[PDB]
């Protein structure tokens, strides 16, 4: 489903509390001492440089998409508390795969036109099949199969 499903989650609290505890400390480890107080973390965002610690984003080198797409801020390089938590919630593959699809989709979808564009289409079957590997090789054959399923 579209942001319609997640829209209901964020507007709620599907996010656990324990995970938050870790963020308060575990993360404050990379944040200055004068910021160790979660009090300044609710307004302060996590610098991209430090975010490199979160493997969740490792999915794509230039997470620049996570900042702008996942978060709506001018910096576009500092995960803010706001969504940060909401991310862990929506990132819950509890329900069917549909939820997961939205997770990886929105993240991989930088344009967000309403479907998988050449941009996502690649990064997509790329991670699954494995760009430049055994599966599909260097070529446009990615259209033959993708078109065979559609
Ligand atoms: Mg797209």
- Domains of the chain, first to last: 1-150 (1.10.238.10)
> Do the annotations mark residue 111 as ligand-binding?
yes
Q: What is d(CA 135, CA 137) in angstroms, rounded to the nearest whole number?
A: 6
Approach to solving? NMR
Distance from Cα 73 to the centre of ligand 1, integer Å? 20
Assigned token pair, 81 = 């508390």
> Do the annotations mark residue 113 as ligand-binding?
yes
Nearest to 123 by CA among 139, 110, 134: 110
Distance from Cα 3 to the centre of ligand 1, integer Å? 14
Burial of 65 (0-12, 13-18, 19+ CB in 10 A): buried
DSSP character at residue 79: E
Nearest to 21 by CA among 72, 103, 88: 88
Contacts of 27 (CB under 8 A, 6+ apart): 41, 46, 53
Instruction: Please provide residue 79's backbone torsions phi and psi, each rounded to the nearest 5 degrees.
Output: -55, 115
> Do the annotations mark residue 109 as ligand-binding?
yes
C-beta of residue 103 within 8 angstroms of C-beta of residue 90: yes
Element (H, E) at 78: strand 78-79
> Do the annotations mark residue 11 as ligand-binding?
no
Supply angle C-alpha 131, 111, 42, rounded to 5: 100
């Amino acid at each position: 489903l579209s942001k319609e499903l997640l829209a209901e989650y964020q507007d709620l609290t599907f996010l656990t509390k324990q995970e938050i505890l870790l963020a308060h400390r575990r993360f404050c480890e990379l944040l200055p001492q004068e910021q160790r107080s979660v009090e300044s973390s609710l307004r302060a965002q996590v610098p991209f440089e430090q975010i490199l610690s979160l493997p969740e984003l490792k999915a794509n080198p230039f997470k620049e998409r996570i900042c702008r797409v996942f978060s709506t801020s001018p910096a576009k390089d500092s995960l803010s508390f706001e969504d940060f938590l909401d991310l862990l919630s929506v990132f819950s593959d509890t329900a069917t795969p549909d939820i997961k699809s939205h997770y990886a989709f929105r993240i991989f979808d930088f344009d967000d036109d309403g479907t998988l564009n050449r941009e996502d289409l690649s990064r997509l079957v790329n991670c699954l099949t494995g760009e430049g590997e055994d599966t599909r090789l260097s070529a446009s054959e990615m259209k033959q199969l993708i078109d065979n399923i559609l």
